């Protein structure tokens, strides 16, 4: 079944940009809950279907979307987060940089639009840098709740805008979080994602 991926660093390795207690709760509590809920959903869909109860199997689709989205979203999230002193922060280079410039004008303009995109989210949700699977063309998208980036879009970089991703440190000052997190984004990971398939 699905498992919680370990982090590549200690919970407090993203300070002062994200607090240890946030990293701790977020990974060990919130994501774990999505892992658990993802396994429970697949198991119920399975057991309902072996019984020919499609009404029941189809009634689990929202929980599969919520938890399956959560597990995926957070997995990609830790992956593109890293300590500022090491591979976190800065900006991309090579092929990824060139497409960002060609699709957004500059990295700085992309940053602004993404922060703007994050700001505009009403309630719980995510903003993503994504590409078209076929052309590679880049876009800034947002997702409500745990809805994922899938299908025609491949996700490259995600910032979680749920209140639980920042409130303990930044409280209602969500702008400060959105500005701060760029220091711990791992653009090496984003490039790998972009430069593949």
Q: Applying CB under 8 A, which residues contact its own copies? A: 2, 25, 29-30, 33, 38, 42, 45-46, 49, 52, 54-55, 57-62, 64-69, 71-72, 103-105, 109, 113, 116-117, 122-125, 132, 134-135, 137-139, 144-146, 148, 150-152, 162-164, 167-168, 171-172
> Two tokens at 49?
């279907």
Contact 115, 178 (CB under 8 A): yes
On whether 93 is known to bind a ligand per the annotation, the reply is no
Sequence-distant (6+) residues with CB within 8 A of 59 are none
Sequence-distant (6+) residues with CB within 8 A of 61 are none
Residue 120 binds Na ion (CB under 5 A): no
Answer with the entry of Mn ion, its own copies, Na ion, none that 131 interacts with (C-beta below 5 to 8 A by kind).
none
Query: Please, what is the Cα angle at 144 between 138 and 149, to 5 degrees?
Result: 35
Answer with the entry of its own copies, Na ion, Mn ion, none that 72 interacts with (C-beta below 5 to 8 A by kind).
its own copies
DSSP helix/strand/coil, 28: helix
Residue among 67, 57, 174 at smallest CA distance from 127: 174
Distance CA 164, CA 160 (A): 9
Distance CA 81, CA 132 (A): 23
Answer with the entry of Mn ion, its own copies, Na ion, none that 160 interacts with (C-beta below 5 to 8 A by kind).
Mn ion
x/- map, 5-34, Na ion, by CB under 5 A: --x---------------------------
Closest to its own copies by CB, 60 or 84? 60
On whether 27 is known to bind a ligand per the annotation, the reply is no
Which residues contribute to the annotated binding site? Answer: 26, 74, 160, 164
Instruction: List contacts with Na ion (CB under 5 A).
Output: 7, 61-62, 65, 78, 81, 103, 137, 142, 144
């Amino acid at each position: 079944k699905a498992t919680l991926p370990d982090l590549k660093y200690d919970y407090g390795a993203l300070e002062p940009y994200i607090s240890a207690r946030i990293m701790e709760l977020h990974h060990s509590k919130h994501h774990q809950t999505y892992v658990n809920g993802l396994n429970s959903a697949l198991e119920a869909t399975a057991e309902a279907e072996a019984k020919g109860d499609f009404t029941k199997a189809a009634s689990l689709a929202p929980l599969l979307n919520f938890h399956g989205g959560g597990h995926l979203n957070h997995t990609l999230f830790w992956e593109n987060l890293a300590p500022a002193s090491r591979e976190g922060g800065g900006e991309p280079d090579g092929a990824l940089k060139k497409a960002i410039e060609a699709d957004f004008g500059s990295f700085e303009t992309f940053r602004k639009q993404m922060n703007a995109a994050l700001t505009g989210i009403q309630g719980s949700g995510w903003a993503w840098l994504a590409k078209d699977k076929d052309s590679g063309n880049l876009a800034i998208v947002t997702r409500a709740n745990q809805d994922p980036v899938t299908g025609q879009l491949v996700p490259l970089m995600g910032i979680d805008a749920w209140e639980h991703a920042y409130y303990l440190q930044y409280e209602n000052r969500k702008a400060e979080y959105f500005e701060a997190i760029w220091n711990v984004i791992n653009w090496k990971t984003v490039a790998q994602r972009f430069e593949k398939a």
